[PDB]
Amino acid sequence: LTAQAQRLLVVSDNQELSLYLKEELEKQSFERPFNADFCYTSFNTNPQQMMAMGATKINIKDEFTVERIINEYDLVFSLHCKQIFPAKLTDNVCCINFHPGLNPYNRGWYPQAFSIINGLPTGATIHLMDADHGDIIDQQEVEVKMSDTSLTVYRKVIAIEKHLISRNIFTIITRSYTTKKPQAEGNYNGIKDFNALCELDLNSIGTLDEHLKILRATTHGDFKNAFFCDEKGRRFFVRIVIDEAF
Amino acid sequence: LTAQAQRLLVVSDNQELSLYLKEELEKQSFERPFNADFCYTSFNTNPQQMMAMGATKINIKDEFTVERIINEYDLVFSLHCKQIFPAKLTDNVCCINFHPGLNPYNRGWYPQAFSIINGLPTGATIHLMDADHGDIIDQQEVEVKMSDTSLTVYRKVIAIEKHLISRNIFTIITRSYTTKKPQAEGNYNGIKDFNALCELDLNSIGTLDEHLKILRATTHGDFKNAFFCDEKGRRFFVRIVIDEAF
Ligand SMILES: Cc1cn([C@H]2C[C@H](O)[C@@H](COP(=O)(O)OP(=O)(O)O[C@H]3O[C@H](C)[C@@H](N)[C@H](O)[C@H]3O)O2)c(=O)[nH]c1=O
Ligand SMILES: Cc1cn([C@H]2C[C@H](O)[C@@H](COP(=O)(O)OP(=O)(O)O[C@H]3O[C@H](C)[C@@H](N)[C@H](O)[C@H]3O)O2)c(=O)[nH]c1=O
Ligand code: NA
Numbered sequence: 001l002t003a004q005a006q007r008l009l010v011v012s013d014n015q016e017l018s019l020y021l022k023e024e025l026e027k028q029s030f031e032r033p034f035n036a037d038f039c040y041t042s043f044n045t046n047p048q049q050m051m052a053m054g055a056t057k058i059n060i061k062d063e064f065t066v067e068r069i070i071n072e073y074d075l076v077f078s079l080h081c082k083q084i085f086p087a088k089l090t091d092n093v094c095c096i097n098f099h100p101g102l103n104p105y106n107r108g109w110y111p112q113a114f115s116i117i118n119g120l121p122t123g124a125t126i127h128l129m130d131a132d133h134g135d136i137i138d139q140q141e142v143e144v145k146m147s148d149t150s151l152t153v154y155r156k157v158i159a160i161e162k163h164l165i166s167r168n169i170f171t172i173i174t175r176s177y178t179t180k181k182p183q184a185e186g187n188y189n190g191i192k193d194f195n196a197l198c199e200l201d202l203n204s205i206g207t208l209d210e211h212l213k214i215l216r217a218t219t220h221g222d223f224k225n226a227f228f229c230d231e232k233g234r235r236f237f238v239r240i241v242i243d244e245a246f
Numbered sequence: 247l248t249a250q251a252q253r254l255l256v257v258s259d260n261q262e263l264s265l266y267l268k269e270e271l272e273k274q275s276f277e278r279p280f281n282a283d284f285c286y287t288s289f290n291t292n293p294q295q296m297m298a299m300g301a302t303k304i305n306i307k308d309e310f311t312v313e314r315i316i317n318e319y320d321l322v323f324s325l326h327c328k329q330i331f332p333a334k335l336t337d338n339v340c341c342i343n344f345h346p347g348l349n350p351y352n353r354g355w356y357p358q359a360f361s362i363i364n365g366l367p368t369g370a371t372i373h374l375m376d377a378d379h380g381d382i383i384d385q386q387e388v389e390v391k392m393s394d395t396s397l398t399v400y401r402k403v404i405a406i407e408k409h410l411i412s413r414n415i416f417t418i419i420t421r422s423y424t425t426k427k428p429q430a431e432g433n434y435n436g437i438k439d440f441n442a443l444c445e446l447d448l449n450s451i452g453t454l455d456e457h458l459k460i461l462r463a464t465t466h467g468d469f470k471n472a473f474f475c476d477e478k479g480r481r482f483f484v485r486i487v488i489d490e491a492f
């Protein structure tokens with residue numbers, strides 16, 4: 001509960017935040033010995049980017065791997081880790097998640113996209129992992145403008161995550177934080193909910209506002225997310241661009 | 247009715263088609279003397295581009311200018327001329343319009359944008375000007391894909407206009423064409439109709455298809471056409487991008 005972590009495992013499928021954390025850790029001076037290992041899980045993200053920064057592949061669904069983690073580390077980060085941590089892992093070693101949403105709202109998948117749809121707050125959250133709603137170590141909201149798309153909000157979120165990492169890393173490693181309980185249940189969205197946003201139904205009836213929000217939520221730079229089909233079922237991918245002027 | 251035109255006035259606010267025509271005319275050899283003068287009318291198009299290619303400014307609402315044209319030229323082109331030719335002009339000298347639409351459909355303003363909205367045929371038309379529906383010298387349809395925007399269709403139209411200019415310029419100058427009468431009344435759209443498309447109403451209820459068509463019709467490269475407002479009435483300009491993939 002109280003002693004400095006000396007052996008940290010970072011499980012991450014995001015190179016940008018992994019590099020940021022690794023550089024932040026190099027700036028710290030801890031009284032007790034400290035080592036951090038980085039690992040990735042996800043073939044369908046950017047595994048070679050993670051390799052390129054020195055991470056190795058780990059499989060959290062390997063029950064032996066989980067026993068090794070419990071016996072070999074005293075703290076584990078889920079830094080945009082795509083694999084689920086099982087109860088056996090979270091029950092037996094302190095596991096901390098770095099989530100690119102503002103808990104308790106739009107938990108789960110692509111929080112900023114759902115925030116564009118439903119107008120709920122977003123941002124980043126550092127929270128404990130417990131075998132639905134881990135207690136929060138720190139979080140910070142970001143602003144969503146009517147011009148923003150999923151990418152624009154996401155970059156704000158990443159920036160705020162980095163800030164939270166710099167603000168909290170010393171206290172986390174020294175185990176010198178108090179958490180707060182979430183104050184509301186909020187809500188959760190899954191990958192299938194995002195796919196449903198992407199499958200545009202040309203016949204669907206709604207307000208222009210509803211429709212523009214779907215496009216903004218599913219526009220993320222040049223990703224091919226949202227699409228409609230013709231009668232032969234050729235897919236047409238759709239993106240929106242919104243600009244304010246003088 | 248039958249003799250070669252020897253003195254052509256081209257009134258144009260489109261440099262691209264004016265240059266194309268001027269180069270096409272330089273390739274012709276006519277038995278009788280032939281000269282063409284180019285003029286532009288529109289301060290709010292690209293008047294300095296027209297100047298740069300040697301055109302001079304003309305005002306068709308100058309009643310004296312019109313009398314001079316009638317006494318000084320034997321053929322007049324409206325090559326995307328933004329000023330209205332009055333009856334006095336069209337009644338007294340052969341005036342020919344080069345229209346970036348497929349008559350009789352979506353006559354008037356930005357034909358391809360309205361074709362994206364209403365699914366009517368578009369393309370280009372060369373027709374006589376008579377003091378609603380001049381007889382047609384030649385026209386050719388272009389294809390509209392579900393991925394196209396106003397710009398994509400417009401470039402096709404410009405390409406086909408050029409083709410029609412090359413196909414028809416000798417016959418026009420020699421006055422050796424037969425026209426056909428339009429076969430249907432079709433329809434007309436004005437500038438105010440386009441502005442109404444651009445003023446997005448976020449509360450408006452419709453199909454996603456309707457809404458995507460509005461965006462495609464009002465997307466034309468980086469033009470700031472379509473916009474919504476926030477509660478303070480800051481305008482947010484909107485464009486769509488649609489791409490087919492493998
Ligand atoms: C793969 C993919 C991503 N995106 C956008 C939306 C996302 O918010 C953004 C980043 O995607 P990403 O796969 O790197 O996801 P991450 O930003 O790492 O986060 C995702 O996984 C974490 C493990 C979870 N804790 C997060 O809740 C979940 O949203 O890119 C798309 O718009 N389309 C896509 O196909
Ligand atoms: C000025 C303006 C243009 N556009 C797009 C749509 C247009 O089809 C395209 C070209 O515009 P333009 O002003 O050069 O128009 P032109 O292509 O020269 O044609 C227009 O004037 C001729 C005299 C008329 N005969 C045509 O029916 C009318 O559409 O650019 C926009 O999307 N937004 C704009 O504000
Ligand atoms: Na704290």
Ligand code: NA
Pocket residue numbers: 382383384423424425
């Ligand atoms: Na003809």
